[PDB]
Structures are given as C-alpha cells and as structure tokens.
Design a protein around this ligand. Structure first.
Ligand SMILES: CN1c2ccc(-c3ccc(C(=O)N4CCC(CCO)CC4)cc3)cc2-c2[nH]ncc2S1(=O)=O
Length: 254
C-alpha cells in the first residue's frame, strides 16, 4: 500500500544520524518525477526483532495527517530496510535557530510555536500523547514552516511524569511550554548546568525557566500557564493555539 519499489528511490548524502542508523536525503520518482525525501536507514534490520521496532515508527506515523507533522511517504521492508518520509529541507530546529539567532524576526519564532500548537491540538483530538515534546524533535521545512518529527528528558518533563510516570495531554502541554521557551531562546537547552535530579526540587520551590530576552510578556505568560504544577490548571492545546494566533497577529502588526 505504501511499500515503495527500491528502484524509485535514489539514495543521496547522509544528512543525520538516527537511533537505528544514518538518515539520508534522496529523490523519490513516482507517477512527481523528482520528490525530495528523507530516508531513514537501519543498520541491524537484518534481525527481525530490530526490523519490527524500526518499522513501528512508520506504522505510528501512518495514522496522522497534518500540515505540521512529518508525513510518511512509504517503506521498503526487505534488506536494507528503509522508511521514506517527506524531507524537511532546513533540518533540525535547534541548529536552525542557533545560526539565525540574529536574523529570524520574532514573528517567525511565534509562528513556529503556533504551528506546533496546531499539530499538538490535532494530536490531543486524536487522543494521542506524545511524551517527548522538545525542540530536538522539531524539523524545519521552510523559513515559514516547522513540523513535529520523532514518534529520560527530565528537564522537559512535567512534575507528575517525573514523580509518578503519569503521561497525558496535560503533561505534553508542560513539555510544549518548555519547547516554546527553547524557540524564543534561539535553541538553548533548558536548565543548562543543572543536574537532572535537582530539577523537580527547583520546580517544587516554585521556580520556573525565566523570560527569554526579547520575548513578549504575553507569550512568556502563556508559557508559565503551561507550567502550572497541577495538570488540571494547564490550558488545553486548543486554547494555546487560540492564544498563540492572537499573539502572532499582534506581532505581525508591529
Ligand atoms: C530526524 N530526521 C531528519 C534529520 C535531519 C534532516 C536534515 C539535516 C540536515 C539538512 C541539511 O542539509 N542542512 C544543510 C543546510 C542547513 C540550512 C542552514 O540553516 C540545514 C541543514 C537537511 C535535513 C532531515 C530530517 C528529516 N526530514 N524529514 C524527515 C526527517 S527524519 O529522518 O525524521
């Protein structure tokens, strides 16, 4: 159904490293003659136990269809086993933001947050809990378009996830707060120089990540709402989407 004949794929250069092996860009020739694609490879998929786990990412991704979630294009299930995805040409978000620290305007940063919130409101409506929302798992398709990729990170995790391994859409909202902070910090990691074991203590003392330089206070406020200790007091993703739209439109008007 989405099994792709290997001769329709031209493997190109290695563009990254994955859990199971190198990621390449490539070209997919279909009945579009030259579609740019990402190809996830798997070093040890000659073993079926590894193959089953590798190909699970594809099965998971197949269930989603959203403009801000990376699309599965297809798979090749014989050795070498590949997963074919749309290429996000500008690569990982953190690296992208770091090199454009002084060249992306604030409206673009807010747009990325908004776009991610639309993907996450979609996932919440599908009753899908992500568990790992972080800038490391976001890819850049174009200067005006980011997409959620992936499918313990203590410094991103909600207190209930840390303490009791509770994961819900409300814990995803906490993580998304941290991801928004990362974006407005131009790809700096949260709690740099702080030991993982000490994170929950700071949180429990009422401390939170600080307002990023040049971040609109309305937007930092929204981040802080994501970091309510009580998950029931956090906004739902649809509310974040609504508020981010307003913040975005206000910034576009500057
Ligand atoms: C994790 N995945 C990826 C990892 C790296 C890159 C990636 C890395 C580097 C580049 C790249 O060539 N550059 C060079 C130019 C840079 C622009 C300057 O900011 C962007 C990085 C492009 C894509 C793309 C993907 C990807 N796209 N679609 C699905 C996936 S993935 O396999 O899930």
């Amino acid at each position: 159904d989405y099994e792709i004949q290997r001769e329709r794929i031209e493997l190109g250069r290695c563009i990254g490293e994955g859990q199971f092996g190198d990621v390449h860009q490539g070209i997919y020739m279909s009945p579009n003659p030259a579609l740019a694609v990402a190809i996830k490879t798997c070093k040890n998929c000659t073993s079926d136990s590894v193959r089953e786990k590798f190909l699970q990412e594809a099965l998971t991704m197949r269930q989603f269809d959203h403009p801000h979630i990376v699309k599965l294009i297809g798979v090749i299930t014989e050795n070498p086993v590949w997963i074919i995805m749309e290429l996000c040409t500008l690569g990982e978000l953190r690296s992208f933001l770091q090199v454009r620290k002084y060249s992306l305007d604030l409206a673009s940063l807010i747009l990325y947050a908004y776009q991610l919130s639309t993907a996450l409101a979609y996932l919440e409506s599908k009753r899908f809990v992500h568990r790992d929302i972080a800038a490391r798992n976001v890819l850049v398709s174009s200067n005006d378009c980011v997409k959620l990729g992936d499918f313990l990170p203590i410094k991103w995790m909600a207190p209930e996830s840390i303490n009791f391994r509770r994961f819900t859409s409300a814990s995803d909202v906490w993580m998304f707060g941290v991801c928004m902070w990362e974006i407005l910090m131009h790809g700096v990691k949260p709690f740099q120089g702080v030991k993982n074991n000490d994170v929950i203590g700071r949180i429990e003392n009422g401390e939170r990540l600080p307002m990023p330089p040049n971040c609109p206070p309305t937007l930092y406020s929204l981040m802080t709402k994501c970091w309510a200790y009580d998950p029931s007091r956090r906004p739902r993703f649809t509310e974040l989407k609504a508020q981010l739209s307003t913040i975005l439109e206000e910034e576009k008007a500057q």
